[PDB]
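Notebook entry, cofactor series.
This is the third protein in the set we're modelling with a bound small molecule. For this one the ligand is N34. I'm keeping the input format identical across the series so the outputs can be compared line by line later. Sequence and SMILES below, as received.
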Amino acid sequence: SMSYTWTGALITPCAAEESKLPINALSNSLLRHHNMVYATTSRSAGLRQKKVTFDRLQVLDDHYRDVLKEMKAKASTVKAKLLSVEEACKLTPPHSAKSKFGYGAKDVRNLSSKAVNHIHSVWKDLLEDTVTPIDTTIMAKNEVFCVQRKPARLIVFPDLGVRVCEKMALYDVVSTLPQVVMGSSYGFQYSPGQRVEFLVNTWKSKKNPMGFSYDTRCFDSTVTENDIRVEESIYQCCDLAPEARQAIKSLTERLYIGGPLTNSKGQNCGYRRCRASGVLTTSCGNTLTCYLKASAACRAAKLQDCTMLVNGDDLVVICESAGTQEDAASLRVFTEAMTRYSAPPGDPPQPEYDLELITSCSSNVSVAHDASGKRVYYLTRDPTTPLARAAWETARHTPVNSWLGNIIMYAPTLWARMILMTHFFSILLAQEQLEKALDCQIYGACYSIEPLDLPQIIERLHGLSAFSLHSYSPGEINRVASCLRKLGVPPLRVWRHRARSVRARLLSQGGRAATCGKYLFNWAVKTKLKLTPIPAASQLDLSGWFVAGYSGGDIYH
Ligand SMILES: CC(C)(C)CCN1C(=O)C(C2=Nc3ccc(NS(C)(=O)=O)cc3S(=O)(=O)N2)=C(O)[C@@H]2CCCN21
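Returned structure with ligand:
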């Protein structure tokens, strides 16, 4: 079937959309080549619609059913609970889109009776009716990039009332099921420090390692009715309350499988027969479907001892090599199999024989040295998009502070420490806003974080070495330097100078500000301080950080 059918009506914005990088007094201190950075808008959505609209064919074999049988067997060991309305309301982000039915996210969060009553009636209706398609809104995402332009990504989501019901029915399932079914292969269970450890151990477990990432062309669009019905059959394997069972089937038939699309102005835009990016089960569904299809494709292509690492639609596979001729021919069969399962690639996969050349979750393995001269593996990426977005957020306040999520997940890196840490701590200092909790997304869920808790956070997710890493690789150094040149970002020597200043100001203030200055900026000074375990690091409640992915699932933690 066609992933989408269109009425010809336009995908529309809510407010005005900026595509040009906004510029304030602070912009040039980060980035000179302003015209390199742009944000997507609804006005390029027609180009995206084109791309994501295709027929899907699916041919399912015995390897496919075998793996599926395996997944169901493990899924049947899961016992999952129904969440109360109240519990589910509290999982709702403050900034979440308001209901068409006269209440918003904060009404939900403070449990107003208009919110609670409508939610109760959406749930009742789910139990009563398993056939009537639920309405969704299609919006264009506004995202920031550096020019190479990408058209806007689309987001399809149901009304807030329905989203709270999804939580009630499926939050425990999507939080717990994926690790049980997929074990060590489930990407979203890992801190960055654990993920790199898993990658290295896995590489090191192979006699002759070969790895490749697999980029599916528009994963959501490739997801068929069958796939969505298959993922539901996996949810129903769990020990569920009968109201959860009924709710899950109903959300599946009425929402997940497909339904009508409406713009922000209330016009009918068409119909969807593929994955919605803005539902609770988007991340879990993609991961189950990706791992199912990949595992089955691995058996068809006869890949030796293939180890999967899956994060929603993101797939890296590490296996035994059979030499370059055979590896290359194997990956073609792997791709043919995936293609038959309706997950063809955008870029064709290539085998890699160096772990550091594999990009997965937009990230590659790299190596640095700690205090004791010990080699240390850490995860990194091309700093171009992180810096473009940092540049946007330097002049515009945003719902998600990507800069902050990046500092958390890329703490050990050269660019995050020298540029991102320096720039943003300087800004918090000037505004006396160090104490101010900021929102950011990690693995799709929204977190309220205090910038001053960063030292503890970094210690827990990466280890202390993150505060002591030096002697980065020429590869990493070259990519960073060429990013700064391309973007017009001051050289790293400037950032070192600025940091000594930022550091001194932090230390001057004592308390947690001083802690940040000591741990985050030890690299800036020649005469280093001694970095011991942070007392507060062990006290931090970081449970719920690396349990699951929730991309598009409206989760606040
Ligand atoms: C350093 C690390 C450990 C390699 C992580 C890098 N990395 C992320 O991979 C990430 C992330 N990964 C995803 C991958 C694939 C999908 N596909 S889907 C739509 O669910 O089907 C979704 C998501 S996400 O939205 O849950 N967010 C983060 O949220 C964090 C935060 C800054 C960047 N960082």
